[PDB]
RNA sequence: GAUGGUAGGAUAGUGGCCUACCAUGGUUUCAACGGGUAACGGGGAAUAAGGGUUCGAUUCCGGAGAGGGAGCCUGAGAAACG
RNA sequence: AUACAGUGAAACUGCGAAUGCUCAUUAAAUCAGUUAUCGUUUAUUUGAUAGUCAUGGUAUAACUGUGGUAA
């Protein structure tokens, strides 16, 4: 029973390990455990130099065995004592377990595998494949490598059988509820279209049903199968020895991208412009931090004195300090000295320290708020480090608009330090994960040239048909996702799985009108809207947070929808296509396959009491919704590190139900904001506060209400609160002889009871004067801070102050 | 034991069978004449 | 967060996985033997009354 | 003594110079700046309680010997249109660099600089109350 | 505490075993004491050598330890050291 | 056998588990002999031996089930 094996299997593994690539296998079957270690031994015997370690990832179970060596040895010893074996017996699988090197890892601990390199990885649980996870492991598998997925489930077995028998039809059972792994179906089909993948069973009877069904063995008997990056490795290299103190470190530098990025930094060292940043946009692990190590090496060998390191968090300063080449002194440690020995990490909020400093490096600029970004782009020298094509941070267009609101040359790192370029798994992964965002740069719509909003149309998407892997639908999907990534600032990879498989989530496209010729060419979106049905119709967010902030069993019984994403482009931000789409969607609510594109008409929505948008608070979008028709509902208090802005939610209702509890909430929330100023957003912009308070004023002075209006205060309660000596000193500073502290003692509650609508109607001072009042009595900041806020270098501040408190005095 | 069986495989010619289941380089830098060798080394 | 909730008259002990931060932070800062409602945690737990009996940490 | 204190690889150290009136405290502080940017790691943060003579405190760069030339408004570094005789480029200029070519200042009321600082040079800290 | 008294604690139990309170003693050229002792030593301890010249065979060595000082725990009996 | 009685795993409980090798040398010490215990202790052995509610409450283990953790 020493059976044969099809040529595809060892042919693929040998060809991969001599092309420095990665292969991927999926095993259906009853065991797969016994068929694994044959592959591992086979891969070493294909090549004796490649890395040994195998990573095993699982959700919470282990297939028929356990890891603790004491447990396995005790069990097997006791099995000898109970007499079920022979003394010197160990099967191939358990041999593999207790002989190789394994890192076991959970799913949730997926972040402890970042910097390592593994020879093989194993994914045990197929029905919980987070995109973020899959990105982790596949990126960290070294070249000449194997990625193997185990597929013990009859459910996926029937799924794949059905898909192979009919690509168009599928198999969906509602025994799960309303959750179906459309992302996993797309995974399986794209894997079918992979150029070096394989689907195989137990006993390795390879299935031709999918994958690279026909690989041929290369003749690897040659030394010239060598990439152009290898071919133009350093050949005019000044590696000579009479003097080469940086030539040593350039020879340490690995790729040609690393080498001429180092050339960029040395040209920058020669360059003596003051306000300057040297920009590296990199793929991940491609020599970014390595270039950081050579940059710090060169800039302490020859640079000013040393550099301040700035990071939003302590990320792998592990490797940033692990770049070495003996403690620092004036001895021949220089080319090893310009490294770990000056351990002084600082916090990136010390931008004035940075302005003083000789040279500053910034790492992963995508997690830095833009005011901090400019405060570090003062008039001095900075090395900017960021990851394009990348999770957890910025995008290409986001970084370009960053440097354009900023400002010099940029450099992008691409060549992977581990595996071979042009990699099939890397390309296929970029395709499936959909991070190839270049659709903005395409020559059809590289410019902003778009029609006018007189005719634009919403389309609801049959997302099942969308995520069904059909190439035109696929094409449409990267187009819209490129829009999505350009629209946001920072993105997570699981979100694609989120809207693909989340039942209550819906997507809409504002599109130009149909081409009247045939409708055969590709539609090209203008805006994309992501919402989710949330409420008693059932999404854990909105009624929960409302119930927490105010006891409202009525709100618990309510049902509506939350807008998660508005999706436009800075090329289209000129006019308000989003406002067009907003009006259209609000009008829709309050007024052999299923088709790829469904018209908005043939799908009745449910009964939506309310619509609420959730977003990180900014001036532009706040102004946008404020010009639009949403009630300011809630603002958080602690701005996170990443966004730098407190979260904030808007609501809007316009139905036959005249709500007015929204108006009650608006009055409460304006009062709450009045409380919360000078507490947590003690220091933020007064005109922003002004915009918020007047938007709240609009919201609680919307239509359909008459008891929500303010009643006039009483002079009885006035004298109840104040003191006649305070009134005397009010008239005294009205005579302008006293001190502004002796008025600021009583300024803030004057602002408080002033900012009620009684005094709002009595005396109208809604200008820069009211801005100054808000700043000095409720933002409670210095007169000097107000002065440089208004950029008025004189006592104009006290001029308007004297005017307005004078107006108060003749009121009194 | 590469040519022999281990695990459960043995590798044939191709068809794997499985079971059932500075002065140093200055001197030796040979495209240099000794004249400029000693000239550089003196400087 | 996994919760083993038992009702001992029926002998019905059932576990639940919760995915949030908020409901578990509601149950935070308690000792064994006390009581916490079901309305602060679950829309399907209104009128439910749950007594702590024990637990296991993450290790 | 202070360069020995600098060569000490500790994080925390206090170097104190209690001088009488009329002994060149500004000369001492500028020498501290030149020393601890020439061999020091990164750069130094300088604090005075007032807009003091920090301009000349940086002007003690290679001059400031027997003839110091402390001048009111005639002095050449005080004059804006100047060549400070010790200009910087891609040159071995370090001790003639750690000075008036990089005039920088910290208000003592913004004490977060000196709460996350690495090396500071302080003119006249006796007037500073103890918690700050 | 060296000798003794008286009293008490302690111990299963006497007794300076231990503490108070005291008395000021005891051993000694009959050599105390001290030193070395190869003290793997000796004991008719041991069956003997049913005739080897003194020799065999057995038994007691004596104590301590169970990583190393320190402390605790049960059981009739342990200062058990698995 | 309609309480069981055969047999019997898990466990309660009773008792035993106080009859192992290595390292250090003392001449009333040890050892041998001989006392005494009207001065003590003793599980076990055997021998005697106590006139001073047609039946009171408990609990567990095991089992069932639900879980945690690399262990």
Quote the CA–CA distance of A531 and A561 in Å, as a whole number: 7
A751 neighbors A774 (Cβ within 8 angstroms) = yes
- Residue A54 phi, psi (nearest 5): -120, 135
Interatomic CA distance for residues D101 and A358, integer angstroms: 12
Could you tell me which residues are beta bridge partners of residue A529?
Answer: A508, A566
The tokens 């916490």 sit on which residue? C36
Cβ A68 to strand F below 7 Å: yes
Q: Which residues contact A781 (CB under 8 A, 6 or more apart)?
A: A683, A775
Query: Is-contact A797 A787, C-beta < 8 A?
Result: yes
Q: CA D104, CA A408: separation in Å to the nearest integer?
A: 25
- Please report, for residues A13, A14, A45, A198, the alpha-carbon distance to residue B17 in angstroms, rounded to integers and kept in the order given: 15, 15, 14, 19
A528 phi, psi to nearest 5 deg: -135, 135
8 Å CB contact between A299 and A265: yes
List the one residue out of A123, A159, A157, A147 whose CA is nearest residue A196: A147
Q: How far off is chain C from A412, nearest CA to CA, in Å?
A: 39
Residue A89 CB contacts under 8 Å (≥ 6 apart), including other chains: none
C-alpha–C-alpha distance, residues A3 and A356, integer Å: 73
Residue A385 tokens read as 């480090």
Residues 190 to 229 of A: which have CB under 8 A from any B CB? 202-204, 217
Query: From CA A703, how far away is CA A693, in angstroms rounded?
Result: 18
Q: How far apart are CA A134 and CA A110, in angstroms?
A: 9
Contact A3 B40 (CB under 8 A): no
For A171-185, the DSSP string reads ---GGG-S---HHHH
Distance CA A784, CA A791 (A): 10
Distance CA B13, CA B29 (A): 43
- Is A548 in contact with C22 (Cβ distance < 8 A)? yes
Asked if residues A92 and A86 have their Cβ atoms less than 8 Å apart, the reply is: no
> Scanning the structure block, which residue is given the tokens 């970014």?
A288
- Which residue in A304, A306, A353 is closest to D45 by CB distance? A353
How many whole angstroms separate alpha carbon A621 and alpha carbon A737? 45
Say if CB A433 and CB A137 are below 8 A apart. Answer: no
**Nucleic strand F within 7 A of Cβ C34:** no
Helices (H), A143-181: 154-165
- Cα distance between residue A364 and residue D71, in whole Å: 48
Q: Are A626 and A687 in contact (CB under 8 A)?
A: no
Residues A727-766 as b or e (16 or more Cβ within 10 Å = b)? eebbebbbeeeeeeeebeebbbebbeebbbeebeeeeebe
Which residues of B are less than 8 Å from A95 in CB distance?
7
| Chain A residues with CB-CB distance to D42 below 8 A | 305-308, 342, 344, 357-358
Beta-bridge partners for A648? A615, A635
Q: What pairs with residue C49 in β-bridges?
A: C37
User: How is residue A176 written in tokens?
Assistant: 């799960």
Q: Of A463, A466, A549, A468, which Cα lies nearest the Cα of A502?
A: A463
β-pairing, A102-105 vs A54-57, is parallel
DSSP per-residue letters across A419-431: S-SS-HHHHHHHH
Among A140, A133, A66, which residue's Cα sits nearest to residue A106?
A133
Please state, in angstroms and as integers, the Cα–Cα distance from residue A59 to each residue in A31, A126, A176, A290, A493, following that order: 18, 9, 19, 33, 18
Give the integer Cα–Cα distance in Å for A89 and A75.
13
Rounded Cα–Cα distance for residues A564 and A491 (Å): 13
Closest to A269 (Cα-Cα) out of A307, A303, A305? A303
Q: At what resolution in Å was this solved? A: 3.9
Residues of A in contact with C43 (CB under 8 A): 556
Exposed (0-12), middle (13-18) or buried (19+): which is D38, by Cβ within 10 Å?
middle
Instruction: Answer yes or no: are the C-beta atoms of A39 and A33 closer than 8 Å.
Output: no
Nearest CA distance, A205 vs chain B (angstrom): 11
Q: Do D116 and A350 touch (CB under 8 A)?
A: yes
Sign of CA dihedral D57, D63, D67, D71: negative
SS3 category, A613: strand
- DSSP, collapsed to helix, strand or coil, labels residue A633 as strand
Beta strands in A469-620 (DSSP E): 505-511, 527-535, 559-567, 598-599, 611-616
CB-based burial, D58-69: b 16+ in 10 Å, e otherwise: bbbbebbeeeee
- Technique behind this structure? cryo-EM
Does the annotation list D27 as a binding residue?
A: yes
């Amino acid at each position: 029973a020493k059976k044969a094996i099809d040529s595809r299997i060892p042919s693929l593994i040998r060809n991969g390990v001599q092309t420095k690539q990665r292969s991927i296998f999926v095993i259906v079957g009853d065991r797969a455990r016994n068929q694994l270690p044959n592959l591992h031994y086979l891969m070493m015997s294909a090549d004796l130099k490649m890395n040994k370690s195998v990573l095993w990832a699982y959700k919470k179970k282990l297939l028929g065995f356990t890891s603790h060596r004491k447990k396995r040895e005790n069990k097997i010893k006791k099995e000898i004592k109970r007499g079920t074996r022979e003394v010197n017996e160990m099967d191939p699988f358990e041999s593999f377990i207790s002989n190789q090197n394994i890192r076991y890892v959970y799913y949730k601990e997926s972040e402890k595998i970042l910097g390592n390199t593994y020879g093989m990885c194993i994914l045990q649980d197929f029905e919980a494949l987070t995109p973020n996870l899959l990105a982790r492991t596949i990126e960290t598998v070294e070249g000449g490598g194997i990625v193997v997925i185990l597929l013990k489930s009859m459910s996926s077995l029937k799924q794949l059988y059905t898909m192979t028998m009919d690509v168009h039809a599928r198999y969906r059972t509602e025994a799960h509820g309303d959750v179906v792994a459309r992302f996993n179906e797309r995974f399986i089909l794209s894997l079918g279209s992979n150029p070096n993948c394989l689907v195989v069973d137990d006993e390795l009877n390879v299935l031709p049903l999918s994958g690279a069904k026909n690989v041929k063995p290369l003749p690897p008997k040659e030394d010239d199968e060598l990439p152009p990056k290898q071919l133009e490795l350093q050949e005019l290299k000044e590696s000579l020895e009479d003097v080469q103190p940086a030539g040593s470190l350039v020879s340490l530098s690995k790729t040609v991208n690393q080498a001429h990025a180092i050339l960029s930094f040395i040209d920058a060292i020669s360059e003596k412009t003051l306000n300057f940043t040297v920009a590296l946009t990199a793929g991940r692990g491609r020599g970014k931090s390595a270039a950081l190590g050579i940059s710090i090496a060169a800039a302490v060998s020859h640079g000013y004195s040393n550099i301040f390191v700035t990071s939003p968090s302590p990320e792998n300063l592990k490797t940033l300090f692990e770049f070495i080449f003996f403690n620092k002194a004036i001895v021949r440690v220089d080319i090893k000295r310009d490294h770990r020995q000056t351990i002084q990490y600082i916090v990136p909020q010390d931008h004035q320290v940075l302005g003083q400093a000789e040279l500053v490096v910034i790492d992963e600029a995508a997690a830095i708020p833009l005011p901090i970004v400019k405060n570090l782009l003062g008039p001095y020298l900075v090395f900017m480090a960021s990851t394009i094509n990348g999770y957890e941070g910025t995008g290409r267009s986001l970084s370009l608009k960053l440097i354009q609101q900023l400002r010099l040359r940029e450099i992008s790192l691409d060549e992977p330090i581990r595996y071979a370029p042009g990699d099939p798994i890397e390309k296929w992964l970029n395709k499936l994960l959909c991070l190839d965002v270049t659709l903005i740069k395409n020559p059809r719509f590289a410019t902003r040239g778009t029609p006018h909003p007189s005719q634009c149309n919403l389309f609801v998407v049959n997302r099942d048909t969308l995520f069904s892997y059909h190439p035109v639908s696929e094409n449409f999907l990267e187009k819209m996702m490129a829009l999505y990534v350009s629209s946001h600032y920072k993105n997570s990879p699981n979100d694609l799985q989120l809207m693909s498989d989340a039942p209550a989530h819906k997507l809409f496209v504002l599109l130009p009108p149909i081409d009247p010729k045939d409708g055969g060419r590709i539609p090209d979106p203008l805006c994309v809207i992501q919402i989710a049905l949330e409420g008693e119709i059932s999404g854990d967010l909105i009624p929960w947070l409302i119930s927490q902030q105010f006891q409202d069993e009525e709100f618990a019984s309510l049902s509506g929808a939350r807008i998660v994403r508005i999706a436009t482009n800075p090329e289209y931000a000129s006019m308000g296509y989003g406002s067009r789409a907003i009006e259209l969607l609000r009008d829709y609510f309050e007024g052999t396959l299923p088709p790829l594109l469904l018209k908005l008409s043939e799908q009745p929505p449910h009964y939506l009491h309310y619509l609420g948008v959730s977003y990180g608070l900014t001036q532009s979008l706040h102004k946008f919704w404020k010009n639009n028709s949403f009630v300011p509902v809630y603002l958080r208090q602690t701005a996170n590190d990443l966004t730098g802005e407190h979260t904030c939610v808007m609501l809007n209702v316009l139905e036959g139900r005249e709500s007015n509890w929204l108006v009650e909430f608006a009055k409460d929330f304006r009062k709450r904001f009045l409380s919360l100023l000078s507490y947590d957003f003690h220091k933020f912009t007064a005109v922003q506060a002004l915009s918020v308070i007047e938007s709240s004023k609009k919201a609680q002075d919307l239509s359909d209400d008459e008891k929500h209006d303010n009643k006039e205060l009483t002079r009885t309660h006035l004298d109840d609160i104040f003191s006649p000596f305070d009134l005397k000193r009010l008239d005294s500073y009205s005579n302008n002889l006293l001190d502004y502290h002796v008025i600021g003692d009583m300024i803030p509650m004057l602002a408080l009871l002033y900012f009620g609508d009684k005094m709002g109607d009595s005396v109208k001072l809604s200008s820069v004067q009211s801005a100054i009042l808000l700043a000095i009595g409720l933002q409670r900041k210095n007169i000097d801070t107000i002065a440089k806020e208004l950029n008025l270098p004189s006592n104009q501040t006290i001029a308007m102050f004297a005017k307005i408190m004078r107006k108060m005095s003749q009121y009194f | 034991a590469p040519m022999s069986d281990v695990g459960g495989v043995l590798m044939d010619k191709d068809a794997v069978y499985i079971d059932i289941g500075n002065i140093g380089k200055l001197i030796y830098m040979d495209n240099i004449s000794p004249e400029e060798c000693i000239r550089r080394w003196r400087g | 967060m996994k919760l083993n909730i038992s009702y001992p008259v029926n002998g019905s002990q059932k576990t639940f996985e919760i995915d949030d931060e908020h409901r578990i932070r509601v149950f935070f800062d308690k000792r064994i033997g006390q009581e916490v409602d079901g309305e602060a945690v679950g829309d399907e737990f209104k009128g439910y009354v749950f007594k702590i009996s024990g637990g296991n940490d993450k290790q | 003594s202070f360069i020995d204190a600098i060569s000490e690889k500790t994080l925390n150290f206090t170097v104190a110079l209690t001088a009488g009136r009329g002994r060149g405290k500004s000369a001492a502080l500028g020498i501290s700046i030149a020393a601890a940017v020439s061999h020091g790691y990164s750069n130094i943060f300088v604090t005075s309680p007032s807009p003091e003579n920090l301009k000349t405190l940086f002007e003690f760069i290679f001059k400031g010997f027997d003839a110091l030339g402390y001048q009111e408004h005639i002095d050449y570094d005080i004059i804006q249109s100047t060549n400070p005789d010790f200009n910087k480029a891609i040159v071995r200029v370090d001790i003639k660099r750690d000075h008036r070519q990089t005039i920088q200042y910290i208000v003592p009321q913004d004490h977060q600089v000196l709460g996350q600082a690495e090396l500071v040079v302080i003119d006249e800290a006796a007037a500073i109350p103890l918690p700050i």
